């Protein structure tokens, strides 16, 4: 299934481009339906293209069916889902935060905000 992504993301682009991302919501509609996974990130580039449809989208719907693809997609890279106590929450020198970075460029922050 990776031409099925690339063809979502190539979709998704050119509603980006023009700034017309309302088309968006059937994309995304059918990405909950399809097995994502990092490899699939890294190759199609997808994390990038819905994460651009979240920000060029008014479509509130459309927003809203992007960032939950980006929190679902996120795991893949991450370990997330599955991870174990760490040495901090999730774990200590997440080098994951730099994938993400490539796949779908959500910003970066330090983290690791605890009170006591």
Known sequence: MEDEVVRFAKKMDKMVQKKNAAGALDL???LKNIPMTLELLQSTRIGMSVNAIRKQSTDE???SLAKSLIKSWKKLLDGGSGSGSG???SGELSDKKNEEKDLFGSDSESGNEEEN
């Open 28 to 30: 995304l509609k059918e």
């Open 61 to 63: 719907e459309v927003t």
């Open 87 to 89: 040495s901090g929450s």
